[PDB]
Ligand binder design. Structure first.
Ligand SMILES: [Cl-]
Ligand SMILES: [Cl-]
Ligand SMILES: [Cl-]
Ligand SMILES: [Cl-]
Ligand SMILES: [Cl-]
Ligand SMILES: [Cl-]
Lengths: 326, 326
């Protein structure tokens, strides 16, 4: 039932530009996904109108809800008997992602509404987790949420720090982006009691998540920044590390190096066009591109341990569709 | 070992103005409290400097840390064998309170730091909870945190609403203030396996918490508003319900009634001095005062079920010291 997974082999049959999200990724777990939605409405809305609206509005903003869909896919790939528990776990994953977005939307509705809605969602997610009655799952989630918060704080500490290393960037993005993908996929394996699939699914999702954040960062130094709901140079303004900037420093000397460095330290608008030009022409973006492809390769390799099912194929198709953004 | 608890009897021996917090409340659980502090530093700080500082600074701002002290007192009152678990529960209670404060400090360090520090504390608290390995406790906390968030949202929905009832106010304050006190005391009984003490300790803490929020509200319409780190009329500006204002409406007719009503709806500064005067002279503050004394009486009654120990005496002394603020 199991077999090797190769990016080059996928490309032989199936160009990534051909991959459709509804038919090639969602379709296997479609009914399950639709059943997840019914559970969420019960999960949040009837008591407080302000939350279901915001959580609806937030969900309305931006991307397809891949995180819960991945959870549902790993559960089927694990032959989970009680998929209702997968649907509940998918909802937890989604409420947690939504909480994080609403909380990242707070700036220095409104901030108080956003803070309170995020807290409410964290509370319901954790109450739903407790209802699943699995202490292994609870401990994974509790340690994991600490790692997510630690990642987010590490990023805040690394703001306007030109000396930030690639090691540190990978540490940050694993915390702030990758760990939630791991909870989604490995938590599915934990639910199914498929302990042999836990580490493969974790490694898959972590590498997936790593490539996902590298591409996001790349896109903020290109004309497709709007796709992320951002303007070009936004990350620069905030002084967040980002691999394009770290790599730009690695691919620059003399005055160009000094400009990028000062720009990170100060975060002034004056040299912003110059900095974007250096990042684009230094080769830094190509370096980030290669790193994202390498992570995508590591993701698919970890997946190849699982049996060849439509559910595995869907996860593979998602990884390639994500990579195709660049 | 057990006996009746009477406010009038306490007053026969012991005027509330005589009650000292260090000697009459903290002293029994002093060593335990000091041991809780060592655990918290391990609990948060070494990984991220930004959190231990804020959580130190936040703790530095404002009141004695009664919530963890109450937890420690209920645990001893329950004859808990493993007090190290009480100390861990006390830390959870404290990180949760601290999270709530830092989150309430966000306005429409800075907001992003406050949001992230609050989230980090919620994550560590929940990971410490999971480590206690008690599913009854976890479910109490998970349902309870939902009720806290629901209370906070209900308050946001009731902002600038003159029609808000006393029933609704009690609902709000039980959620936003009382429930955390219940988790502290009943969670201690849950740890000790003293199921017969759970409901008495819950009722005690809930009534305590109810009287605690009524007095806070009263104080914002008096010269002792600064004690809460507030200016007089602040609650009015934000449009939060508060029993003084609801009661002022109940104790007013004609134009004075209209002024208060419009003031709640609009939240303008122009009639603010007039509104404060009406609240002070209508008898509304006396009504709130009586309600707080009644809640204090209900708190002590629920406590009287427990054995007469120094730990029970300390909880009694705390309730009276809290009431003495007015
Ligand atoms: Cl998502
Ligand atoms: Cl199964
Ligand atoms: Cl590809
Ligand atoms: Cl406290
Ligand atoms: Cl015990
Ligand atoms: Cl008294």
């Amino acid at each position: 039932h199991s077999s090797g997974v190769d990016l080059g082999t996928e490309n032989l049959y199936f160009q990534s530009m051909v991959i459709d999200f509804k038919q090639d990724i969602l379709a296997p777990v479609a009914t399950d996904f639709a059943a997840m939605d019914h559970l969420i409405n019960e999960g949040i809305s009837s008591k407080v109108g302000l939350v279901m609206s915001v959580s609806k509005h937030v969900v309305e903003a931006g991307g397809k809800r891949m995180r819960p869909i991945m959870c549902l896919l790993a559960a089927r790939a694990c032959d989970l008997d009680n998929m209702q528990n997968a649907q509940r776990l998918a909802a937890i994953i989604e409420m947690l992602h939504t909480a994080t977005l609403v909380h990242d939307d707070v700036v220095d509705w409104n901030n108080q509404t956003a803070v309170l809605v995020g807290d409410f969602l964290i509370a319901r997610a954790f109450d739903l987790l407790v209802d699943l009655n699995n202490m292994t799952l609870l401990k994974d989630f509790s340690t994991g949420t600490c790692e997510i918060a630690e990642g987010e704080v590490l990023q805040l500490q690394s703001q306007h720090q030109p000396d930030t290393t690639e090691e540190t960037y990978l540490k940050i993005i694993h915390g702030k982006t990758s760990r939630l993908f791991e909870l989604a996929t490995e938590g599915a394996a934990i639910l199914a009691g498929q302990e042999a699939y836990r580490e493969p699914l974790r490694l898959f999702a972590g590498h997936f998540g790593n490539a996902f954040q590298i591409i996001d960062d790349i896109l903020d130094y290109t004309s497709d920044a709007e796709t992320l709901g951002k303007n070009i140079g936004d990350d620069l303004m905030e002084g967040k590390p980002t691999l394009p900037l770290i790599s730009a420093l690695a691919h620059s000397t003399g005055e160009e190096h000094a400009i990028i460095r000062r720009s990170i330290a100060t975060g002034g608008v004056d040299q912003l066009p110059k900095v974007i030009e250096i990042v684009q022409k230094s080769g830094a973006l190509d370096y980030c591109q290669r790193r994202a492809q390498e992570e995508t390769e590591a993701a698919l390799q970890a997946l190849s341990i699982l049996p060849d099912t439509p559910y595995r194929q869907a996860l593979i198709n998602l990884t390639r569709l994500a990579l195709h953004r660049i």
